[PDB]
Nucleic acid binder design. Sequence first.
DNA 1: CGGCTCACACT
DNA 2: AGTGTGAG
Length: 428
Amino acid sequence: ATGQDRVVALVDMDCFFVQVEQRQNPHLRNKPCAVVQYKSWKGGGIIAVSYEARAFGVTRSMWADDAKKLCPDLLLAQVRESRGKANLTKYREASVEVMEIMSRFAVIERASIDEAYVDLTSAVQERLQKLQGQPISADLLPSTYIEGLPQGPEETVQKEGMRKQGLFQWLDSLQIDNLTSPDLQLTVGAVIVEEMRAAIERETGFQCSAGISHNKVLAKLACGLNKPNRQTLVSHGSVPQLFSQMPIRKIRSLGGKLGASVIEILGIEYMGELTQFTESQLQSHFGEKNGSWLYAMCRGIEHDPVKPRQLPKTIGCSKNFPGKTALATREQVQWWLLQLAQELEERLTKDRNDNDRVATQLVVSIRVQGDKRLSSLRRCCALTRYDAHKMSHDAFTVIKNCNTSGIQTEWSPPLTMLFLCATKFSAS
DNA sequence: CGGCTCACACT
DNA sequence: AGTGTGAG
Ligand SMILES: Nc1ccn([C@H]2C[C@H](O)[C@@H](COP(=O)(O)NP(=O)(O)OP(=O)(O)O)O2)c(=O)n1
Ligand SMILES: [Mg+2]
Ligand SMILES: [Mg+2]
């Protein structure tokens, strides 16, 4: 079991929110640009950054005023604001454009607003059959990188030169006659991804990057290797060298506490080092599921299927009221619950029309001042009507007990966060 | 005051 | 049903 059974691709839009703004606002194109929200506080928080802007060191989770210091000419596009909160509708709609195009080629799993996993196994089989021993031209893979290539013995000075040489080595090595071979399958998968990315760009004007491999983790990792506007094929064989110097945190789901735990407990830095441990050893340290996943993953093997899901399982609205802005009155809490409910209602109504389904559960989450937990309390009630007033009213009923204060016209402790989430969808 | 938004494991 | 982790 070499985990070479599937052909999986992860496609991620390059600086997605920026591209959406750049398409709509042509003046932003091919310039250091960022997308920000909530301009009032420090010029707004940057949530997307063009590659021209990244050259100046501008990053996500950076204040616009600070970004300006690094990049004086940085152009900014503001996230739409509705009812006192950021509205992401344009980006969701832009996302739908991309997802629908991708869906034409194969079943997709919407991993995020700007990326999706594709299981191309079946599509590859069909493509392999359509061409009988047809040699795969380099022209079919104009933006493809083969990780780990070129290897061995002035063209390579340029990145395009390196890409070509690597591709040539790979293609020269490829034997068409073996329809079964995983490398061949990955290659054909890459050809389809080229087509998928060309279609996306032609039809949306959005550029994207892609990773092609035998699983989701490798595909996602591969995608990031040659961003932007490029796709990378990571073969099973490329894994040992790739993982040998690959920081553990870089593997998906290893970015947080578990990753640090793996590093600290095992005293290792790289993904490859995990191979020297028995599955039982890994299981003992990190649990049954994690241990087995780690044992297989460090060998480039993962079995997490590409879920056939294009739609979010939940629709959520929330707002932060940090520090001084915390809501300390009942009226204040009710008004904000209403604003969140109103946006939620609009999105829910659209969802029902577009997707033939209804949310049956309303989830309410709040944060009181002095908690470092993202959520202080979680509570749920039935969502029976797509009405903002009822939903906000119900949400308030569910969380009204949290209010310590006797006066009751005041709210204590003050709420630093309000969250409304529609869940438990059903067909209709 | 890196904000808003999802998915999912564990209990 | 609720809490926490991880991600984008
Ligand atoms: N913390 C984050 C991460 C992403 N996003 C949004 C903005 C991003 O443009 C979009 C996609 O996330 P992302 O793929 O990780 N980064 P982005 O697409 O902007 O650039 P790339 O590095 O992928 O090329 O989700 C966000 O709002 N908050
Ligand atoms: Mg992206
Ligand atoms: Mg992404």
